[PDB]
């Protein structure tokens, strides 16, 4: 069973990729009921570059075809307490994102769920929380509110709401 | 991150040394700034990184502390320094500290003003009580009509400390319908300040 | 030099929305983050969120998440904050301020502030009544007199005396908010009691929100 993302223009199947990391922003000003909220990064290309886990492909919110960590998910930040610094998540096992050529790119739901579960586990240990909530982008240009990527010289845009709306106890 | 700023207010004299503290609910390195704000003016950055003066801020200001406890120190207050101060720790602002000027007790000059005729024609009566140039800020203003306490139909406001003599002034307005204003005779505001009560009054029929 | 200039005061009914602009210059707009703060009258500062000017991504304070929208137009180096579903709790002064990119601490330059008033009341010019000097406002060589600036909306009003030639001994008090939703303010001045029959005293009340200016001559009783 898949998480089937709508994308525009339709990416061709040759633009399918491996998801190797992602980049997050922690919601600011939260009273925190033992709860921490994260969204795809509200930062720009510089936030992405500073993670230093990208490969050749230029992409937002998700790193495509980048470097993997060796044994476990690794989360990094230049200052965990600063909500204006993004959080760099590097996967240890990639998540395939397969594009149909007809306007969607699909991800295995069970694999994505298990990846988030691992990311939540590392965040929880960083922030000493219990409940980790992923929520969608709170706004931005099309490149940053969507999962965006340059494939073959053309820019494609996938709504990522389905990837960041879940709770993890 | 939670922040407790202390004290909420203090009073001091020109030239003496004041200390304002900001406590964080967890270690923050030196990720803190202090700002100054005067009434009706824009907040102004004084210190950041907990201890770095902003350029051109006078030397009497310094900040220190690390971990969870931080201090803004004004080594010798100038008159321009009486103002409100806020710490900022990441996105959390402190509650604010207002620095007031210390001076000797001063009794108020008390005046009263009956409603104007032009207001009365429009069906409302406002009586105004004025407490002029007193100290400290705390004074008890009560309205009494035909010697009965009113408590519910009046409002007051107080100026900021006077730039010249550091006193306060207070205006209180009693507002009644014209019909109720003409049901009564004696209108009075009673000002109580520390072993003195002053009561200014008038009779409606002569004012 | 570095300059953040905000749009003018706003008056809104509850449930409406407001959009305030912050036009900048003197620096590279995309090199710094922009934050928004507000301050309810007489209250402290609180952070509303930041915006990344290069890409437009944002991080809103959880308290405002879902009804604030921050945007920018890099071509004119201007930031915008829109707050929706307004209630009287949103009355206050709103500030834009610049920080270093990817930082929340050093807010070194601020906008001048934008007053936003949220009320079911509507714009109303003041009724200005004299506080006439009398034997109930006289103390030997000094006498008190003033103007009562009643039932106006919204804030602010300014008061001068004798077109600003009278400044010694003037006290203009903070307005109070009546249960009508209208404001009332008093301005007083103490003058020589011997001047009362001879010197003209006029208070000049300016209420820019309603484009009303009232001059009131205060004559002795
Ligand atoms: C992802 O990586 C696997 C090996 O880990 C490879 O077989 C597969 O073709 C890759 N998929 C894409 C879409 O690049
Ligand atoms: C990622 O790698 C796969 C396999 O090599 C390739 O076909 C695909 O085009 C790459 N993705 C992008 C967006 O270029």
Author numbering:
A (entry chain C): 1 to 169
B (entry chain L): 2 to 91, 96 to 212
C (entry chain H): 1 to 52, 52A, 53 to 82, 82A, 82B, 82C, 83 to 100, 100A, ...
Describing publication, verbatim:
In a double-blinded, placebo-controlled phase 1 human clinical trial, the recombinant, germline-targeting envelope glycoprotein (Env) trimer BG505 SOSIP.v4.1-GT1.1, adjuvanted with AS01B, induced bnAb precursors of the VRC01-class at a high frequency in the majority of vaccine recipients. These bnAb precursors, that target the CD4 receptor binding site, had undergone somatic hypermutation characteristic of the VRC01-class. The GT strategy for inducing VRC01-class bnAb precursors is rooted in the hypothesis that these antibodies target the CD4bs with a similar angle of approach to VRC01 and use the same conserved contact residues. To verify that VRC01-class mAbs elicited by GT1.1 do not just exhibit similar sequence features to VRC01-class bnAbs but also target the CD4bs in a similar manner and with the same atomic contacts, we selected five mAbs for further structural characterization.
One priming immunogen designed to bind to VRC01-class B cell precursors is the eOD-GT8–60mer, which consists of a modified and multimerized gp120 fragment. Moreover, VRC01-class bnAbs have very distinct and targetable genetic and structural characteristics. Specifically, they have restricted immunoglobulin heavy chain variable region alleles (IGHV1–2*02 or *04) and a short five amino acid light chain complementarity determining region 3 (CDRL3). First, VRC01-class bnAbs typically have a tyrosine at position 95 (Y95CDRL3) and a glutamic acid at position 96 (E96), which are important contact residues with the conserved Env loop D (N279Env/N280Env). Finally, GT1.1-induced VRC01-class mAbs are structurally extremely similar to VRC01-class bnAbs. Hence, some GT1.1-elicited VRC01-class BCRs acquired mutations that confer strong binding to native trimers with intact glycan shields.
